[PDB]
Design a protein around this ligand. Structure first.
Ligand code: HFG
Ligand code: HFG
Ligand code: CL
Ligand code: CL
Ligand code: CL
Ligand code: ZN
Ligand code: ZN
Lengths: 490, 480
């Protein structure tokens, strides 16, 4: 029965709403900007969270929890960014019917609370480094048009905050966290990305520099930051008097800080990239169910003893899949036809469906069907334990390389501004030589109406030969500092 | 440690949670920073329970932190935090920070249950709620706190009842098997039960320093009350009479940690139950004789590293302390304060005789183990520690639960700092009079394991103003 009524290419938003609802991944909510994560998508987040947490604790980071409320003073004292952020802050100002003396803010991030804590907690050189992480929820009252995973007012993330004695420690951590974020996207979500440094405009305002992983959703034609990992350097230490006495040098020494974060926006990217016109398509490594066994060949008058015999062999296959470490469940609901179940689990996006009927068990075998391809492969029951991991391996690769192919089909390089704007009009992203200065990024953005910097990619396409190369914008005559990636932004 | 449990309980509690690196104070009242050392106790409880209820068929989801006014108001009302402005721009309708999630998840349950085919719904959340509720205290009276709230809907009341009991069994197992704290399973009286429910089961535990009892977790049977409120119904297949589902909800909060502090922490700081301690064993290398020798520094640190490595690989959570800028005794006191179940003192004579001394945080008892037997004695040891803690608490609690049918000794026992099983009518009127004329004592639970069977030919409720035949024996005490 249930099915997608729209298509990715013609009506992307209604397609997206149909895939997150009929994929049982989201329920809408009477508070705007906020969405119910039903269990089918929360398991995606749970896999991402668990994987990344295991990584950063193996690294020596530790898990903590600061309160959801922040003082007006914690917030505004020594402002990180008066910026244009203060409007986006959710303010509690009444208990029941009693208004409170000073109002308290729901956290948008925890710098202004965790940095005073670090100032207390570091009274000597011996107390360093501090590597603390929280898995928490934040609220940003963002005046834009909201969407389930991509622009939400409350969302889950993890924020890691770190303080070291040396800048070398801090630099290397920034890159180790970025490698793990990159792994979240490629190895778990089968999504390709570009590692880079934000330009001076797009960097976190308070940081020394800001690294990032950036991805592209081509169906929409827009690019999106997938995760970031900042090097604050000494800015916040000097702000918050996070100091120790140098063991040799008698003089006060400020610590070197990093912060890094990744949000549930990841899941939205996963949809936009991998979900097709029949519904969701889950990367095998985050799917709550990797393999679903639908017992087939049950007619309106299949008998309870026949039904039970088949159900029982299905549970035995499901069990030897669990014991092989792969996440398999069987669907034994009696008020649903085999075909109804095929369509159900297709909408839900399970990498593999197993059709096992009476004719299959009589030949001691089964059929496996890929959610991405529709490709069917008959496996002898014996080879199950060895064939099914290969398959799930294969499925990931196909999902990934397909996605990367699309990304490379939507990355065009030019040194000429006209070819830049042609490429941008044709719905893709452009590596071009950029002076790096903020004014020129502004002129570029205005004059593509718009196109923002994405990152200065780590893998540069070529080294700028200064005898020739000038920044792609004709109004600045600055020689090109590097290749930068520009595109229309989310 | 500067104060003591026996004489000044509150400032002892404050010194135990501060010098234990568990809590950092915060400029919003009611709210406290869970540092990593206490957050790990929560994480152990969280993971143990989540695995259990996941094995049971419950599934994890996450609903928003915000409820807007309409969702909510469909009697606690003073205690609700209201967002009403973004920045300096006032918002049209104000939204409440969730204090519990019934008013949000139950409309969703009505929308998602379009047929009988859709049952049961078994969903759990690990989330933060705020109830702007006195004189606050870090794990016992917090305005923002962590918990898990699970909400479930079935077709029959039998499923729902049996689940209530299974979850209560799991909470008691949290308290006894993980936190080594004894508890009593029971039913709240109609006065103390969850207002919207049919009934409320509970586990209660005893803190002897205070002489007071505290509710450790709950598991409610909402019956058909909330289904009827929010129209969670299905078509009866036979005659299509709208049928209301039977609902339960259950919860457990970070109050556990506070209970575990107050039950088990002594005058030297925390002492963590082995099954929740982030570090079960900490290795302190001894005898570094301050530049008496330097090459040996790495040699000793290295033998400590292979012992820690074989403890990890044996499944024992062991970390070693190889920091050079701290006195050995400083490390002893540090890990005593933080409550690490076992300290290993390992020196040069120890490494030369192929052994180590492990000393229990609860006992102070010292026991020298040959490295050969290490992987085998150390699990036993930690098993041994848990039992001694639990039985210790058990001893204490049962030396302080008194049975009576007479109000005079009820009120004497209540002066002597313990909790009383007495015959009770069950009425709300009479419970109110009991608390008022005991100043004060509330019902705790009607225990499942009853002390003797009520003979209605004689037994009357212990309060002299109600002459009702006693409905049952219940447990009363002074409580948080
Ligand atoms: O949130 C950040 C910076 C970093 N915080 C720690 C986790 C990783 C993260 O990149 C950027 N940022 C973004 N949005 C914000 C919104 C508001 Br409102 C405020 Cl006050 C502040 C901020 C703000 O600082
Ligand atoms: O929160 C509860 C009832 C149950 N909710 C689901 C998880 C288990 C839990 O016992 C009781 N309770 C307690 N304190 C409250 C405080 C406020 Br404020 C509000 Cl609005 C409501 C409540 C409220 O309903
Ligand atoms: Cl977001
Ligand atoms: Cl930013
Ligand atoms: Cl509490
Ligand atoms: Zn330029
Ligand atoms: Zn009575």
């Amino acid at each position: 029965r249930l099915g997608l009524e729209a298509t990715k290419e013609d009506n992307l938003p209604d397609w997206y709403s149909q895939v997150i609802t009929k994929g049982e991944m989201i329920e809408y909510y009477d508070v705007s900007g906020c969405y119910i994560l039903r269990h089918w998508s929360f398991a995606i987040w749970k896999a991402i969270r668990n994987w990344f947490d295991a990584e950063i604790t193996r690294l020596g980071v530790k898990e903590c929890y600061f309160p959801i409320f922040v003082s007006r003073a914690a917030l505004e004292r020594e402002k990180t960014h008066i910026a244009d952020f203060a409007p986006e802050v959710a303010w509690v100002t009444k208990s029941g019917d009693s208004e409170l003396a000073e109002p308290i803010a729901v956290r948008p991030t925890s710098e202004t609370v965790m940095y005073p804590a670090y100032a207390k907690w570091i009274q000597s050189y011996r107390d360093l480094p501090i590597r603390l992480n929280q898995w928490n929820n934040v609220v940003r009252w963002e005046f834009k048009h909201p969407q389930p995973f991509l622009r939400t007012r409350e969302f889950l993330w993890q924020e890691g905050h770190t303080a070291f004695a040396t800048q070398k420690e801090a630099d290397e951590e920034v890159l180790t966290i970025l490698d793990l974020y990159a792994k979240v996207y490629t190895d778990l979500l089968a999504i390709p990305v570009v590692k880079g440094r934000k330009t001076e405009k797009e960097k976190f305002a308070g940081g020394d520099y800001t690294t990032t992983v950036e991805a592209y959703i081509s169906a929409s034609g827009r690019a999106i930051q997938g995760a970031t990992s900042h090097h604050l350097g000494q800015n916040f230490s000097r702000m918050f008097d996070i100091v120790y006495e140098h063991p040799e040098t008698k003089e006060k020494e400020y610590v070197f800080q990093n912060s890094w974060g990744i949000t549930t926006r990841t899941i939205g990217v996963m949809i936009m990239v991998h979900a097709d016109n029949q519904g969701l398509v889950l990367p095998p490594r985050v799917a709550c169910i990797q393999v679903v066994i639908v017992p087939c060949g049950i007619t309106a008058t299949t008998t309870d003893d026949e039904r039970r015999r088949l159900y029982e062999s299905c549970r035995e296959l499901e069990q030897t899949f669990v014991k092989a470490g792969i996440r398999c469940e069987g669907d034994y609901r009696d008020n649903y036809s085999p075909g109804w179940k095929y369509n159900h689990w297709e909408l839900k996006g399970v990498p593999v469906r197993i059709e096992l009927g009476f004719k299959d068990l009589q030949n001691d075998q089964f059929v496996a069907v890929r959610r991405d391809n529709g490709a069917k492969q008959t496996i002898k029951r014996a080879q199950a334990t060895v064939e099914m991991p290969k398959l799930l391996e294969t499925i990931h690769t196909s999902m990934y390389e397909r996605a990367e192919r699309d990304l490379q089909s939507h990355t065009k390089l030019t040194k000429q501004w006209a070819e830049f704007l042609q490429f941008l009009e044709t719905k893709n992203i452009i590596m071009a030589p950029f002076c790096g200065e903020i004014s020129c990024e502004d002129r570029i953005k205005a004059e593509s109406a718009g196109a923002k910097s994405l990152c200065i990619p780590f893998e540069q396409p070529a080294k700028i030969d200064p005898k020739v190369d000038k920044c792609v914008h004709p109004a600045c005559g600055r020689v090109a500092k590097f290749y930068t990636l520009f595109g229309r932004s989310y």
